[PDB]
Amino acid sequence: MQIFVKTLTGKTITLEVEPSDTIENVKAKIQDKEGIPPDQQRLIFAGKQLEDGRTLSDYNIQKESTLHLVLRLRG
């Protein structure tokens, strides 16, 4: 399935996922695309900050959903 991750600039990236993938899985594919480490990612959906352990379907995230990405960048 396809989902969307949207950043605070409005930039929106398309991800290829299954409803069974964990959030860290989702975070991993993001890292591989834009070179951003998982610990520095925060994914929000429907007001909740998504936890790394839970499944995409656990948050009832379906085809063509949009996630929000906020970055806790470190140095």
Binding site: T7, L8, T9, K11, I13, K33, E34, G35, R42, I44, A46, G47, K48, Q49, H68, L69, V70, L71, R72, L73, R74, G75
Partner: protein, 348 residues
């Protein structure tokens, strides 16, 4: 290539003499105040002159000491050395072991890296061993607007803040993940209160996308960090200037040989024909209401005429400290004598 890549490598014994003074200069008061430095936070390193030597020999010096990647990124992005009215700044190379914030800061004041983890350990104890309620307050308030909770629609329970705050406390420790955890803005702000000295961070405004070259996310690290847990009269009013790029911190030191150009950093970025103020970090609502009066207290603000978008424009800048390191603890003196000795041999 014979020249070392770090100033302290000229006289490691002197660098050890310095690194052994920092721990004994920290005062741990019994009252509950943040622990801080007695005297050494007032030191400032300026970098020796290079324009004297020939062009080819300027490169071997510049290649050895200066972080070319952070220098080139910030300069070509109109963020560093954009103002023709002020002296130049150069980024000293900094170890990337995950402690560059402490490495860059100790280099700006002393010339040595935080090899013995003195600054890093001083940061961790403050967060771990003392009350941090005011820090957590300021951090919550900024995070709400920074991470744009209203925009993303996010809600944080009380546990969400606690877990994120405990994680920032664990980040300050010296535990292995690089060798050490990287740090973020709130750690800079705690650090500046430990030093009683402001920290200006010069960086780009936005992180770019590897796919489209378009803007991906904002970098929020640039801006001013004021030691607001102290009366400004008990603080050193000359700032520490750090450069940020590619999740790396470096000190932005100024050249000792200053022409007519003024020794000051502009407190304003020129983004798109507009003189944008630097973000003043972690203020409270009353403090934000008197933002300029606070700036004029924790810094030494002056007005600098600059070329405006065929006209002259008046911007606010903060005066910068002159090099005040005594000979006994001046690693730049030693490195300069090492440069001159090699420059004699290079002429053969």
């Amino acid at each position: 290539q014979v020249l070392p890549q770090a100033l302290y490598l000229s006289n490691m014994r002197k660098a050890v003499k310095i690194r052994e003074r920092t721990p004994e200069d920290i005062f741990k008061p019994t009252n509950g105040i943040i622990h801080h430095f007695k005297t050494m936070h007032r030191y400032t390193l300026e970098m020796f002159r290079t324009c004297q030597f020939c062009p080819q020999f300027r490169e071997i010096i510049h290649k050895a000491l200066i972080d070319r990647n952070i220098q080139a990124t910030l300069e070509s992005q109109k963020k560093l050395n954009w103002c023709r009215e002020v002296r130049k700044l150069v980024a000293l190379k900094t170890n990337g072991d995950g402690n560059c914030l402490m490495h860059a800061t100790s280099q700006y004041m002393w010339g040595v890296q935080d090899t013995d983890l003195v600054l890093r350990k001083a940061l961790f104890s403050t967060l771990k061993e003392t009350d941090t309620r005011n820090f957590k307050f300021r951090w919550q308030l900024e995070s709400l607007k920074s991470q744009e909770f209203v925009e993303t629609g996010l809600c944080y329970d009380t546990r969400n803040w606690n877990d994120e705050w405990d994680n920032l406390i664990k980040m300050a420790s010296t535990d292995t993940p690089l060798q050490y955890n990287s740090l973020e803005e709130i750690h800079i702000f705690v650090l500046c209160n430990i030093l009683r000295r402001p920290i200006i961070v010069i960086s780009d405004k936005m992180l770019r996308s590897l796919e489209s070259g378009s803007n991906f996310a904002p970098l929020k690290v640039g801006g001013i960090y004021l030691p607001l847990h102290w009366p400004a009269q008990e603080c050193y009013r000359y700032p520490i200037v750090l450069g940020y790029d590619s999740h790396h911190f470096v000190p932005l030191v100024t050249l000792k040989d200053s022409g007519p150009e003024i020794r000051a950093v502009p407190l304003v970025n020129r983004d798109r024909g507009r003189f944008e103020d630097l973000k003043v970090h972690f203020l409270t609502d009353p403090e934000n209401e008197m933002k300029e009066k606070l700036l004029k207290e924790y810094l030494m603000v002056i007005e600098i005429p600059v070329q405006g978008w065929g006209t002259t424009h008046l911007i606010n800048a903060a005066k910068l400290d002159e090099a005040n390191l005594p000979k006994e603890i001046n690693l730049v003196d030693d490195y300069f004598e090492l440069v001159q000795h090699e420059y004699k041999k290079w002429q053969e």
